Structure formats: structure tokens, C-alpha cells
Amino acid sequence: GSHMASMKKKGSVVIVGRINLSGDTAYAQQTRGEEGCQETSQTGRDKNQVEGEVQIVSTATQTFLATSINGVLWTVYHGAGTRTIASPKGPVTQMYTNVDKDLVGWQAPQGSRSLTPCTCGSSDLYLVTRHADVIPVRRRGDSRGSLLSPRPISYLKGSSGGPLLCPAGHAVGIFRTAVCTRGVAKAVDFIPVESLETTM
Ligand SMILES: CC(C)(C)[C@@H]1NC(=O)O[C@@H]2CCC[C@H]2OC/C=C/C(F)(F)c2nc3ccccc3nc2O[C@@H]2C[C@@H](C(=O)N[C@]3(C(=O)NS(=O)(=O)C4(C)CC4)C[C@H]3C(F)F)N(C2)C1=O
Ligand SMILES: [Zn+2]
């Protein structure tokens, strides 16, 4: 509009949970409910303890994932836009933004753990979803991989920003898009970890 004094400000991305991969079982944990998420988005002040590599994140209108690799919390631009992330000291500005790669990054929150970029050159990958499903994916190109067991896109919705990992648990990529036939996701496209390492 033309009245700057009443123009609104978009809130921060807020960590609302995590995918726990510490033990023998992968499972999602929620760490903040909808009400606290809304307040934290407006203030940008998040005093909750952060743990793990894969965070569940939310805005006022979307929920997706964010993954720490080499001390950067990475996610997709189509989820985060240019938004700050909430942190204990106030909103934190993105350190990386690349709409051409559908990629953004913030400094990894204190308490998080980072994945190591994969150097194995392995093509047997594993996609981790927001429901803590571990989905075998065969790498088919620099940025594409096929699901060994296709499933409706509904099962992958909300998992952009999640990791594809190698057999050793290294980060190979950041889940970006699905490739579907009749609503069934047969393959995925991801931001390769090398494209991250270049951005850095
Ligand atoms: C048909 C389809 C499956 C919906 C779509 N496929 C598709 O486009 O495939 C083509 C063919 C192979 C590569 C790809 O080239 C196009 C590149 C798209 C892009 F990624 F570069 C992208 N750049 C943007 C930049 C600025 C603003 C918006 C942008 N929007 C984009 O893509 C958009 C969004 C992305 C998305 O849905 N991601 C996921 C997800 O969970 N999101 S999310 O968490 O729910 C949520 C929306 C909250 C954040 C993983 C897939 C889940 F559902 F499985 N899209 C559309 C798709 O996957
Ligand atoms: Zn590896």
C-alpha cells in the first residue's frame, strides 16, 4: 500500500520441533505448539533449547524442514523466503540466500548438531521426512533421485529442507522438489551438498 506507518512485517521462521536421529529409532518431536509459534514468529525471540540436525520449522502459513550442515541451518527459499529465523537474542538474518537454487541458510542455532558433507560418492541415499520416515532413494543425477518405493506426494509434503543422507550418515543434499505421476512421487530433486559448499 501507500501508507507506510501501517505496513506489516513478516514474522520469523520458528523452530517448532525436530527429527530425532540420535538413537536406534527415528521419530519426530514437537517442541513448540501453534500459539507459542505465532508469538515467537512475531517477536523473533525463541528461548527454547535446540538439539539435533533436522529441525521442523514453521511460518505463519507454511511448515517444512531445516537441516544443519557445517554450521549452517539450511532450508528452501520457497518455504522461508527472505525471512529471519527466531533465536534467543532476537531475529537472525539469513547468511545465504539463493532463489536460483531455492536455497537459504542461517547460522546454525547454538545447541544444534551439524551433518558432515558427504565425500563418499555413493548413490545409495536416504531421505528423512518430517514424519521421521526414512525413504531409500537411488541417486540418478547431480540433483535427482528415484524413490525405491514410490508413494503419494502427500507423504512428502512438508519435508522440503530435509536431508538426503549417504549410508554413512553424511549429508548429500537438501530435499527441494518432487517428481510425480498422477499424484505419486516417483523421484525427488535436491540441492546437492556441493552446491551448498560452493555457496559457502
Ligand atoms: C509439482 C510439485 C511436486 C508441487 C513441485 N515439483 C516441481 O516443481 O518439480 C520440478 C521438476 C523437477 C525439478 C522441479 O523444477 C521446478 C523447481 C522448483 C523449485 F523447487 F525450484 C522452486 N523454486 C521457487 C523459488 C521461489 C519461489 C517459489 C519456488 N517454488 C519451487 O517449487 C515449488 C515448491 C516445491 C515443493 O513442493 N517442494 C516439496 C515440499 O515439501 N514443499 S513444502 O514443505 O510442502 C512447502 C510448500 C512449505 C514449503 C518437496 C515437495 C513435496 F511436496 F514433495 N515444488 C513447487 C514441487 O515439488
Ligand atoms: Zn558419505
| Rounded-to-integer distance, Cα 21 and Cα 38, Å | 27
Q: Which ligand is nearest to the CA of 145?
A: 1
Indicate the top mutation candidate among 75, 78, 131 to test ligand 1's pocket, ranked by most ligand atoms within 8 A of CB. 78
Give the residue numbers annotated as catalytic, written as ranges: 78, 102, 160
175-183: long-range contacts (C-beta < 8 A, 24 or more apart)? 175/65, 175/127, 176/76, 176/102, 176/143, 177/102, 178/153, 179/144, 180/153, 183/152, 183/153, 183/154
Question: Is position 170 annotated in a ligand binding site?
Answer: yes
* Contact indicator for 171, 118 with CB cutoff of 8 Å: yes
Write out residues with Cβ below 6 Å of ligand 1: 62, 64, 77-79, 99, 102, 153, 156-160, 175-180, 185, 189
Method: X-ray
Q: To what resolution in angstroms was this structure determined?
A: 2.0
* Contact indicator for 19, 132 with CB cutoff of 8 Å: yes
Domains, the chain, with CATH or none: 4-107 (2.40.10.120), 124-199 (2.40.10.10)
Looking from the CA of residue 156, the nearest atom of ligand 1 is 54
Instruction: Indicate the DSSP class of residue 10.
Output: -
Taking residue 34's Cβ as centre, other Cβ atoms within 10 Å add up to 9
Radius of gyration for the alpha carbons in the chain, expressed in angstroms and rounded: 17
Answer positive or negative: Cα dihedral of 192, 194, 198, 200.
Answer: positive
